[PDB]
Amino acid sequence: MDSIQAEEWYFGKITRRESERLLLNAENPRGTFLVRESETVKGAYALSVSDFDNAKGLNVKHYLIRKLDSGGFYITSRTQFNSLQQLVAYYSKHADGLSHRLTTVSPT
Numbered sequence: 001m002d003s004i005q006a007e008e009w010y011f012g013k014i015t016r017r018e019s020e021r022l023l024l025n026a027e028n029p030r031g032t033f034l035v036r037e038s039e040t041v042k043g044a045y046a047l048s049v050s051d052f053d054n055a056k057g058l059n060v061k062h063y064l065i066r067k068l069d070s071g072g073f074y075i076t077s078r079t080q081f082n083s084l085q086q087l088v089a090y091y092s093k094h095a096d097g098l099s100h101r102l103t104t105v106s107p108t
């Protein structure tokens with residue numbers, strides 16, 4: 001499997017604030033996204049996704065991706081993935097509990 005660093009949507013140690021600055025671009029389709037390290041939960045990841053909310057308008061959603069020491073990743077413990085690549089593919093197809101499905105890799 002490709003290392004996560006080879007994936008166009010993986011931005012590593014980009015901060016939550018830096019991810020919001022990027023994803024709040026009004027040109028980005030709803031569901032523009034990247035994956036990053038979590039700043040608050042060591043060893044976890046975050047899925048950061050451009051959104052349009054009925055009340056808040058343009059906003060960025062952040063979903064915490066937990067990593068099992070035994071192997072695998074999840075946002076909801078009932079729905080586990082063997083890789084971040086599998087997780088991104090799954091949430092690209094359907095929201096299944098996110099605000100919106102993933103549509104667009106954050107441009108850079």
Ligand SMILES: N[C@@H](Cc1ccc(OP(=O)(O)O)cc1)C(=O)O
Binds near residue numbers: 037039045061063
């Ligand atoms: N519901 C939380 C879930 C969350 C928690 C932490 C997290 O990592 P970081 O602090 O790097 O954004 C990402 C998502 C949120 O909207 O922030």
